[PDB]
Write a protein that binds this ligand. Structure first.
Ligand SMILES: CCCCCCCCCCCCCCCCCC(=O)OC[C@H](COP(=O)([O-])OCC(O)COP(=O)([O-])OC[C@@H](COC(=O)CCCCCCCCCCCCCCCCC)OC(=O)CCCCCCCCCCCCCCCCC)OC(=O)CCCCCCCCCCCCCCCCC
Ligand SMILES: CCCCCCCCCCCCCCCCCC(=O)OC[C@H](COP(=O)([O-])OCC(O)COP(=O)([O-])OC[C@@H](COC(=O)CCCCCCCCCCCCCCCCC)OC(=O)CCCCCCCCCCCCCCCCC)OC(=O)CCCCCCCCCCCCCCCCC
Ligand SMILES: CCCCCCCCCCCCCCCCC[C@@H](O)O[C@H](CO[C@H](O)CCCCCCCCCCCCCCC)COP(=O)(O)OCC[N+](C)(C)C
Ligand SMILES: CCCCCCCC/C=C\CCCCCCCC(=O)OC[C@H](COP(=O)(O)OCCN)OC(=O)CCCCCCC/C=C\CCCCCCCC
Lengths: 459, 57
């Protein structure tokens, strides 16, 4: 697995010894090459896993997330090129260093055969994101956002650590393989109930759960474009990956303990979808839509059936790509208008038609139009939920309707109607922005041709 | 016929011919507890190293 980790580490000396006007070109080229290298982990087995060494292993749950993580860095560099143009060379190199460090931590987090090593890297990711938000954010609220984004996480993550070490004192190991093979039933006890809660809440706060989702709109609205991209695409999926990994030792207590979280998710998806209907901020709207999709993923993981896990994997990948694209489109609007308010710049289809096409495709894929992988994950989760209880179909159908409603509302408000008269600084879209949108969207429509690559280890 | 002892003669340490048996346990001591096993052997490398969390060495 070092054939991916070492080039990512070499990205740092290459960045810092680059010329003042060659940092973006070199970083983008070598990040794309690293993505191409990482693309060969998709050759998975129907047997156990790709156990490279005692420290790192690969899975068909890990490999799609790793490929997405590698693919996200070049796009983040392209998106950050514009608003960081007036910046000093040292600070641009520091920004690129933060991005590379975040990729390295994510890559090691997703393989991480140990639960303590997974926890350490899972929390190491928290530092570069915090620096990116609180340093290169525009508004005065960024600091506050960072505080929220920090403490929420730690509020859930310190109990997990305690539980983790406790488990190793009783089991003797925290290796995923030994943990899976030597799993024993968890008795219905108060001690076991609190161990279950300690194991779950850390990943639950990062999805985020509906009750604990307040940090996310703050962090996304306050962060720069690359920060928003990585938060929506990869960092939200750490909770899903961790829950899928750790729920193996929580049976049969999950049957009883899942009820409050299932109710919170099934009602909060309706709640956040309706919130999206009355939102004056594009970034806030996209953040709330992300909360709804991750609520569906939480339901999938808690149900804990093969179709649930397949749908959860597919939905995580699809949402990562779609939400990153949506944030990029909103940022292209913001870099022209400097307002970030949806109602201000109107009728942009008449002034920017190709970007209107990109908006339409992104809205269609957020809307879960078949046969997109968004709908593949949605439908698999919905079928699993129907088998769990036939009454869930009501809430799922309401969520689908409201999702279509706010997606097309966001499209119509910004692209249709009459242009705002007093806005005259709207320039033709750049080749960089069009290429960014294309590099987001073509992978989705290619993945719909080979869905088994993103359906996980239970396929 | 008594000759007075000289200086430092009555402070000499002298020997005594006695038939009284030497007390074998004048302190009435109990039996001393057995010592610890004081294990001895040849050192070998630690099995799989430190075995601390994820460290392989
Ligand atoms: C139907 C079969 C067609 C086969 C022909 C091959 C087509 C290949 C397309 C590949 C994907 C598109 C790429 C996305 C970017 C758009 C390209 C662009 O920049 O436009 C500039 C270009 C130049 O024009 P311009 O004047 O310079 O630009 C002016 C403005 O851009 C203004 O431009 P505009 O006003 O002309 O609008 C742009 C256009 C293009 O924008 C789009 O919206 C295109 C994307 C639509 C998908 C939305 C996401 C939903 C997820 C569906 C996943 C399908 C992908 C399948 C695999 C893909 C492989 C990569 O939007 C539309 O026309 C609306 C179409 C709504 C489609 C809804 C139907 C979806 C399901 C259809 C069935 C698919 C599976 C069938 C299975 C059963 C039968 C076998 O215009 C075009 O080329 C238009 C593209 C053609 C329309 C696409 C509709 C059908 C294609 C569906 C995907 C492939 C089907 C495979 C099955 C084959 C049998
Ligand atoms: C920053 C890093 C800058 C470059 C540092 C280069 C070495 C880096 C080693 C770091 C780990 C040190 C260690 O304790 O390794 C034991 C072990 C790896 O030992 P091994 O490769 O199985 O050794 C097998 C034999 O000794 C046989 O070993 P071998 O033949 O594979 O060793 C070849 C030798 C190659 O030697 C050279 O290349 C010399 C010139 C360079 O190794 C290296 O120099 C490259 C490493 O790693 C661990 O036990 C887990 C470490 C997990 C990370 C450390 C804990 C904190 C992680 C979270 C914080 C953020 C981390 C990012
Ligand atoms: C806020 C945003 C979201 C955050 C996350 C929320 C999710 C956390 C919810 C916790 C899950 C449930 C906790 C315990 C579930 C076990 C079931 C139990 O509570 O119900 C009855 C238990 O009876 C009573 O409930 C006893 C507990 C009463 C005291 C709890 C306080 C009630 C309200 C407090 C809610 C505050 C939550 C947040 C705290 C900060 C069952 O009867 P019994 O057969 O006897 O017990 C069987 C279990 N045994 C065998 C282990 C003993
Ligand atoms: C602060 C004090 C917390 C009190 C909780 C007590 C739980 C407890 O002690 O269980 C210990 C239990 C085993 O019981 P034993 O004592 O070893 O033996 C019992 C049989 N003879 O060990 C564990 O599981 C430890 C796990 C950590 C406990 C949880 C502490 C925090 C509460 C649970 C997490 C939920 C809150 C998360 C907050 C989310 C905010 C975003």
């Amino acid at each position: 697995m070092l054939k991916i980790i070492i080039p990512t580490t070499m990205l740092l000396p290459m960045t810092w010894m680059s010329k003042h006007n060659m940092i973006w070109i070199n970083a983008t080229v070598h990040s794309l090459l690293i993505s191409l290298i990482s693309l060969s982990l998709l050759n998975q087995l129907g047997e156990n896993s790709l156990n490279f060494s005692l420290t790192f292993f690969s899975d068909s749950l890990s490999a799609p997330l790793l490929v997405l993580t590698t693919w996200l860095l070049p796009l983040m560099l392209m998106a950050s090129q514009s608003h960081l143009s007036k910046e000093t060379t040292t600070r641009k190199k520091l920004y690129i260093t933060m991005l590379i460090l975040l990729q390295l931590f994510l890559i090691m987090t997703f393989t991480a055969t140990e639960l303590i090593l997974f926890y350490i890297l899972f929390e190491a990711t928290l530092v570069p994101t915090l620096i990116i938000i609180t340093r290169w954010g525009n508004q005065t609220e960024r600091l506050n956002a960072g505080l929220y984004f920090l403490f929420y996480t730690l509020a859930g993550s310190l109990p997990l650590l305690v539980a983790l070490v406790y488990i190793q004192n009783t089991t003797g190991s925290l290796n995923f393989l030994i943990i899976h093979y030597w799993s024993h039933p968890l008795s219905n006890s108060w001690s076991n109930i609190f161990m279950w809660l300690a194991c779950i809440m850390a990943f639950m706060v990062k999805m985020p759960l509906y009750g604990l989702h307040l940090w996310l709109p703050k962090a996304h609205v306050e962060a720069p474009i690359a920060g928003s991209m990585v938060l929506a695409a990869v960092l939200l999926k750490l909770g899903g990956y961790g829950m899928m990994r750790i729920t193996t030792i929580l049976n049969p207590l999950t049957n009883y303990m899942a009820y409050p979280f299932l109710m919170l998710s099934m009602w909060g998806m309706i709640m956040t979808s309706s919130i999206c209907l009355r939102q004056t901020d594009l970034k806030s709207l996209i953040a709330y839509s992300s909360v709804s999709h991750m609520a569906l993923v939480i339901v999938a993981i808690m149900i804990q059936t093969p179709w649930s896990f397949m749908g959860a994997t597919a939905l995580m990948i699809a949402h990562g790509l779609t939400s990153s694209m949506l944030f990029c489109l909103a940022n292209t609007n913001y870099e022209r208008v400097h307002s970030r308010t949806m109602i201000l710049a109107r009728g942009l289809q008449t002034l920017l038609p190709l970007m209107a096409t990109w908006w339409l495709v992104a809205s269609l894929t957020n809307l879960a139009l078949p046969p997109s992988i968004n709908l593949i994950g949605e439908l698999f989760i919905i079928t699993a939920s129907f088998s769990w209880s036939n009454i869930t179909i009501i809430l799922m159908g309401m969520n689908m309707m409201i999702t279509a409603l706010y997606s097309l509302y966001m499209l119509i408000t910004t692209q249709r109607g009459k242009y705002t008269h007093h806005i005259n600084n709207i320039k033709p879209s750049f080749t960089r922005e069009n290429a960014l949108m294309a590099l987001h969207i073509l992978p989705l429509l290619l993945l719909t041709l080979n869905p088994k690559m993103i359906l996980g280890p239970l396929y | 016929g008594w000759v007075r002892p000289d200086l430092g003669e009555l402070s000499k340490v002298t020997k005594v011919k006695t038939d009284r048996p030497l007390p074998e346990n004048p302190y009435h001591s109990r039996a001393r507890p057995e010592p610890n096993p004081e294990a001895e052997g040849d050192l070998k490398p630690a099995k799989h190293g430190s075995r601390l969390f994820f460290w392989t060495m």
